[PDB]
Each structure stands twice: as structure tokens, then as C-alpha cells.
Amino acid sequence: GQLKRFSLRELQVASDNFSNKNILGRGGFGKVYKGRLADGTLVAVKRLKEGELQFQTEVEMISMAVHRNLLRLRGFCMTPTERLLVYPYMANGSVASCLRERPESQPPLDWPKRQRIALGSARGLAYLHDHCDPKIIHRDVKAANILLDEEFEAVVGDFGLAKLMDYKDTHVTTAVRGTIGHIAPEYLSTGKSSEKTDVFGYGVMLLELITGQRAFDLARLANDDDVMLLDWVKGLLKEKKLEALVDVDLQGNYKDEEVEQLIQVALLCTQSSPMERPKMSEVVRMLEGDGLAERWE
Numbered sequence: 001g002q003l004k005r006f007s008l009r010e011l012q013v014a015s016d017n018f019s020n021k022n023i024l025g026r027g028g029f030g031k032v033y034k035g036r037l038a039d040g041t042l043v044a045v046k047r048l049k050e051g052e053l054q055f056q057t058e059v060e061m062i063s064m065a066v067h068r069n070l071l072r073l074r075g076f077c078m079t080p081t082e083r084l085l086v087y088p089y090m091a092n093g094s095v096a097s098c099l100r101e102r103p104e105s106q107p108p109l110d111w112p113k114r115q116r117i118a119l120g121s122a123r124g125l126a127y128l129h130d131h132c133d134p135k136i137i138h139r140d141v142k143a144a145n146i147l148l149d150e151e152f153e154a155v156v157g158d159f160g161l162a163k164l165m166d167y168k169d170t171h172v173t174t175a176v177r178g179t180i181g182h183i184a185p186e187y188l189s190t191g192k193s194s195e196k197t198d199v200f201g202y203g204v205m206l207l208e209l210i211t212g213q214r215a216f217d218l219a220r221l222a223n224d225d226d227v228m229l230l231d232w233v234k235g236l237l238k239e240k241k242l243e244a245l246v247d248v249d250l251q252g253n254y255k256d257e258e259v260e261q262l263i264q265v266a267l268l269c270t271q272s273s274p275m276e277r278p279k280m281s282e283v284v285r286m287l288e289g290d291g292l293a294e295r296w297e
């Protein structure tokens with residue numbers, strides 16, 4: 001059949017009565033917990049703690065959107081109290097973590113793994129926008145929200161802010177949330193989200209993969225550096241040298257032209273004009289080889 005009906009308790013224990021040394025982090029609608037299941041499976045679970053109904057959309061999503069580069073929901077928990085969402089635990093955690101951390105001294109993401117990540121994730125997003133009945137606007141595209149499987153393939157996760165369109169091509173009016181780093185200018189400006197605001201987010205996601213930096217960082221301010229990742233990088237055209245901009249942890253890897261390629265893509269996706277941004281399928285194409293050299297003026 002599919003779609004697992006769970007009973008709070010039989011997942012309090014799976015989370016070892018939940019809290020404490022089981023917190024992968026404070027989520028968007030509560031907290032994320034790593035538990036097991038009776039048979040064996042590592043799951044991560046979302047717990048809610050106090051309008052919304054944001055829950056029921058994340059639940060019947062499964063029934064409208066499935067794809068190997070999209071986190072598949074394992075199951076949920078209702079209860080006339082608070083509610084829960086259970087996704088597979090992801091072997092290698094977020095792209096954020098793998099860049100932001102790591103533990104003891106675990107290794108960094110090499111450049112070709114970063115290229116795969118950009119590709120799969122765009123593939124997952126392209127599918128959301130183009131091959132789903134109501135189109136699905138994700139609304140939280142960022143490195144923290146791209147998860148990695150055991151083979152380090154990207155899966156797009158956390159569908160907390162996802163919206164179902166229809167409403168033709170444009171527009172989904174709804175209040176601005178997420179963090180400052182990944183919000184499109186028109187979005188904050190006009191309170192409207194759309195596929196092109198995902199594109200912007202995805203293009204900032206790439207800047208993170210390439211630089212290793214957060215999108216909005218006071219530590220850069222602590223210097224004479226831009227608080228805004230995009231701004232910082234555009235310290236490219238001027239001050240020559242990727243080198244300084246490219247993630248220090250890479251040294252060994254990448255060929256100049258490799259990175260320049262991804263950057264152009266990131267740049268194309270974060271243009272202030274939504275109309276000139278690529279569609280994600282165009283993005284995939286370019287990651288796939290088709291039509292980047294001329295995409296710009």
C-alpha cells in the first residue's frame with residue numbers, strides 16, 4: 001500500500017522518548033529527531049510545537065510529488081494533540097552541515113560531488129515546477145534543505161514552506177518567510193512567490209556550494225566584506241581570482257573553467273529580474289551541457 005500511520009508513543013520510544021541527544025537541530029515547525037523503527041530504519045522526525053494546517057499539505061504531498069531527488073515522506077502522526085512527520089534519516093546530512101561543519105575532522109566535499117549535488121537538486125526542483133498537477137513552489141531552497149544520501153546524491157527536503165499553485169504561471173500570494181539570505185528581491189518586495197523565487201533560492205544555494213559560505217553572514221561584516229553572499233562573490237568581475245572566493249577546502253580539486261561554469265549558472269539564477277532567470281529545466285540543461293556560453297550578455 002504505502003503511507004505509514006504512526007502512533008505517537010510507538011515513536012516516542014523510537015526517538016527514545018524523543019528529546020535531548022536525539023536533536024539533529026531545531027526545525028521549522030518544532031525540532032528534528034533521529035529515531036529508529038521497530039525493524040530497523042533510521043528516520044528523522046519533525047515534531048510540531050505551537051494558523052497552519054501546513055501539516056496536511058506535507059502529508060498528501062507524497063500523493064502528488066515523487067522523485068529520487070525529493071525527500072520521500074515515510075509517514076506521519078496525527079493525534080488530537082500535536083502532529084509529526086517522518087522522513088528517512090539521511091546518511092550524510094545536509095549540504096550545509098557538510099560545508100558548515102564537520103565533526104572531529106571528517107573530510108570536505110570534493111568538487112565533482114558538488115557538481116552532482118547541483119545537478120540532482122536542480123532535477124528535483126525542475127520536477128516540482130513542471131511535472132506536478134498543481135505546480136509546487138518549494139519556498140525553502142538552501143544548502144540546509146538539500147540532504148545527501150549514502151552515495152552523496154542530493155535530495156531536496158523540508159517541505160514546510162511548500163505551496164501548491166495552479167494559479168496559472170504566476171504568482172502565489174503569501175507572507176514572506178525563510179531567512180534573509182535566500183529570498184528573491186521581488187518576493188520580499190511584492191509578497192509573491194513563484195517558481196522564479198525558487199530559482200533565486202537555488203542560485204544562492206549554489207553560491208554556498210561553491211564558496212562554502214552562508215548567504216547572510218555578519219562575520220563578513222566584522223570585516224569590510226558584504227553581508228550578502230551574492231554581493232561578496234560579485235567581488236569576482238572586479239578583483240580577479242576565484243581562488244579567494246572558491247571554497248578554501250577545495251584547493252586540490254576543480255579546474256578553473258569548471259567553477260566558472262557553475263558560477264555563471266548561480267549568477268544567472270540570482271539576477272534581480274525574475275524574467276531573465278532560467279527555469280530550472282533550463283538550469284538542468286546547462287548543468288547537462290546545453291546552452292550556457294551564450295545565455296548571457
Ligand SMILES: Nc1ncnc2c1ncn2[C@@H]1O[C@H](COP(=O)(O)OP(=O)(O)NP(=O)(O)O)[C@@H](O)[C@H]1O
Pocket residue numbers: 024025026027028032043044087088089090091093094097144145147157158
Ligand atoms: N531526513 C533527515 N536526515 C538527516 N538529517 C536531517 C533530516 N531532516 C533534517 N535533518 C537535519 O535537521 C537539521 C535542521 O535542519 P532544519 O531545521 O530542517 O532546517 P531549518 O531550521 O528549517 N533552516 P536552517 O535554520 O537554515 O537550518 C539540519 O541540520 C539537517 O541536517
